[PDB]
């Protein structure tokens, strides 16, 4: 199936309190595997997966220096932005970037991304064509010109279709046993009392991977979406995920409801009753 290499980057200024904090966090699919935190004791690129320990000193040193280069580059960007936006030097500010690539089964780039945000708002992003930019506001237009004049979209097109794809191949290779696995979810229904002779049936899905899953409650046929409460799939600390969907039903009538779990790790979907 498809796979992706994404990096979440954050640069947040701390005027008066010191130097900006810079972080680079990387993900191969739903797994964190690398991180760089400038607020760390000794700022080095660190492996966040056991399989990345296969990478040697040249990798770690090369990545560390690159991270430090980006860090120093964002410190310049932060100040630059204050000007574009007529901002005082007192406030704290944040620049975020999502950068990565998704390749399909055949190995062709399905999607490449490079998008920026400032203070939680879209700033500028590379388009689908990997040739043009979309600026979010007046200030972004300045960067857009600076980038067109620099042939930046070309540089990125090269990274996305080239380097990004090659490295994703090396990662999936080095950690195939972990990254290409599939943990089927274990589900169970919990009962809960409440006012007006009502009850809360909560369907739980635990210990699965990858993160995509579907949980639905049904009244013997119909999927109760509108009248069902549920949380966003969330990490459980050891590389797997969990989720739950609840529905409030009239007491004594719980035995008419079924929960259905849909996940790629199962031969057939699961069906549970309290």
């Amino acid at each position: 199936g498809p796979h992706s290499l994404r990096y979440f980057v954050t640069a947040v200024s701390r005027p008066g309190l010191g130097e900006p904090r810079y972080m680079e966090v990387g993900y191969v699919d739903d797994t964190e595997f690398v991180r760089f935190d400038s607020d760390a004791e000794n700022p080095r690129y660190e492996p966040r997966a056991r399989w990345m320990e296969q990478e040697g000193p040249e990798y770690w040193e090369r990545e560390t220096q690159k991270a430090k280069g980006n860090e120093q580059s964002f410190r310049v960007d932060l100040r630059t932005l204050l000007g574009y936006y007529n901002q005082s030097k007192g406030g704290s500010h944040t620049i975020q970037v999502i950068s990565g690539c998704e390749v399909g089964s055949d190995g062709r780039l399905l999607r490449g991304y490079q998008q920026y945000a400032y203070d939680g708002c879209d700033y500028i992003a590379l388009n689908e064509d990997l040739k043009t930019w979309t600026a979010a506001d007046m200030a972004a237009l300045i960067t857009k010109h600076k980038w067109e004049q620099a042939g930046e979209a070309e540089r990125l097109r090269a990274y996305l279709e080239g380097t990004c794809v090659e490295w994703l191949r090396r990662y999936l290779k080095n950690g195939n046993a972990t990254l290409l696995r599939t943990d089927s979810p274990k589900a169970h229904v919990t009962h809960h009392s409440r006012p007006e002779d009502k009850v809360t049936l909560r369907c739980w899905a635990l210990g699965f991977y990858p993160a995509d899953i579907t949980l639905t409650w049904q009244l013997n046929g119909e999927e109760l979406i509108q009248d069902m409460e549920l949380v966003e799939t969330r990490p459980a600390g050891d590389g797997t995920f969990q989720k739950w969907a609840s529905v409030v039903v009239p007491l004594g009538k719980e035995q008419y409801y079924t929960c259905h779990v849909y996940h790629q790790g199962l031969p057939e979907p699961l069906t549970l009753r309290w």
Binding site: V9, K66, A67, N70, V76, T80, I95, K146, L156, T163
Partner: peptide, 8 residues
């Protein structure tokens, strides 16, 4: 490997 960024 993440890309090296350009200035805004």
């Amino acid at each position: 490997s993440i890309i090296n960024f350009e200035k805004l």
